[PDB]
Amino acid sequence: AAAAGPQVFDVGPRYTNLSYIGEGAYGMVCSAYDNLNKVRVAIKKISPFEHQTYCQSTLREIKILLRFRHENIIGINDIIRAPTIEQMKDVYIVQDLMETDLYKLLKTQHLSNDHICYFLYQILRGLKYIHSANVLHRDLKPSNLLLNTTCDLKICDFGLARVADPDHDHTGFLTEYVATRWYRAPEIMLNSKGYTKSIDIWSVGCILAEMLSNRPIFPGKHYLDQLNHILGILGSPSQEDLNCIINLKARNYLLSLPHKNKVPWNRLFPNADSKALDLLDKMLTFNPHKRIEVEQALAHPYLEQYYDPSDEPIAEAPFKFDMELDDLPKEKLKELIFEETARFQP
Numbered sequence: 102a103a104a105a106g107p108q109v110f111d112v113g114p115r116y117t118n119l120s121y122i123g124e125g126a127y128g129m130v131c132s133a134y135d136n137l138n139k140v141r142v143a144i145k146k147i148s149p150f151e152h153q154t155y156c157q158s159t160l161r162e163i164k165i166l167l168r169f170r171h172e173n174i175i176g177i178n179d180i181i182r183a184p185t186i187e188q189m190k191d192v193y194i195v196q197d198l199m200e201t202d203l204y205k206l207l208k209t210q211h212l213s214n215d216h217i218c219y220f221l222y223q224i225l226r227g228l229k230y231i232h233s234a235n236v237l238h239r240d241l242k243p244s245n246l247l248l249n250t251t252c253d254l255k256i257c258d259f260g261l262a263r264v265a266d267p268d269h270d271h272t273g274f275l276t277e278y279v280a281t282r283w284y285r286a287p288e289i290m291l292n293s294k295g296y297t298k299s300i301d302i303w304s305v306g307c308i309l310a311e312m313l314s315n316r317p318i319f320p321g322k323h324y325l326d327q328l329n330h331i332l333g334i335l336g337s338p339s340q341e342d343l344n345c346i347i348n349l350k351a352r353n354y355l356l357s358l359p360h361k362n363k364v365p366w367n368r369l370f371p372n373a374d375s376k377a378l379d380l381l382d383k384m385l386t387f388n389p390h391k392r393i394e395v396e397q398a399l400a401h402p403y404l405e406q407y408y409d410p411s412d413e414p415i416a417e418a419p420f421k422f423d424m425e426l427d428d429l430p431k432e433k434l435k436e437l438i439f440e441e442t443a444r445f446q447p
């Protein structure tokens with residue numbers, strides 16, 4: 102069994118010429134030469150079976166990525182595991198090799214307006230498909246946007262993804278959340294479990310702002326600081342928007358804060374395209390009910406060079422129902438993972 106910076110990285114007769122590409126979630130990542138297709142590919146070794154949290158993110162992701170087929174969403178090309186559940190200690194996920202991601206790119210490169218527009222287009226194109234499947238990604242951020250050398254973009258990391266559940270979105274004030282702080286919508290801190298599509302649009306608005314300036318727009322250090330960052334730019338919410346918050350504790354918290362006026366987008370982003378800022382405004386709307394939806398965003402004038410609804414496909418087979426993974430033990434998740442990955446066995 103071949104080794105890499107060991108540790109074991111054994112990917113069978115198909116994948117050769119390994120090179121260690123750092124680490125990721127639950128193990129090591131390498132590129133490899135794929136001998137069937139004669140391309141280099143990315144392979145993630147996943148060892149999740151000791152922790153039920155890792156098992157859930159692994160299963161969730163596999164089920165979703167195997168069902169989805171879209172240009173702007175990373176595919177699973179192959180899955181390598183032992184032929185029996187008993188012998189299966191690890192799973193290897195094979196995906197297209199993408200050179201970089203938007204987090205790495207923004208660390209050193211200024212994007213032209215043309216690049217911002219095309220990246221945003223592809224983010225929203227992929228998101229349209231996801232949302233059309235009744236799925237929420239829930240952790241959109243620059244590092245989950247993979248890029249190649251020709252600017253093709255693909256959304257990755259569906260480990261926190263869920264079937265949309267707007268009827269069950271309500272929760273109390275200061276309910277703990279798992280997804281990445283700087284990209285969390287204000288309602289997550291107030292009254293929302295993040296079970297509606299509007300959570301993802303907020304994250305895209307954060308990403309757009311980050312592309313415009315190469316810095317995160319709302320870099321909170323903790324929970325209420327995240328909200329204070331947001332309120333620092335958007336200003337105090339209107340009485341109408343406060344009235345939509347029925348949660349007394351959340352509403353009263355907002356009423357306790359000193360009044361803040363809106364910081365104009367064109368003062369924050371003086372070099373930005375005006376149409377970009379108009380779209381940004383509509384994505385970073387405080388009230389999630391008033392926030393633009395994915396298809397409206399696609400149709401916004403900023404994206405008019407690319408918008409073509411006939412070439413912005415939707416899912417054939419949406420996930421109608423809640424997957425019921427939260428309430429399943431490690432061992433059971435491992436059995437489902439085995440079944441889900443059977444398709445790739447010779």
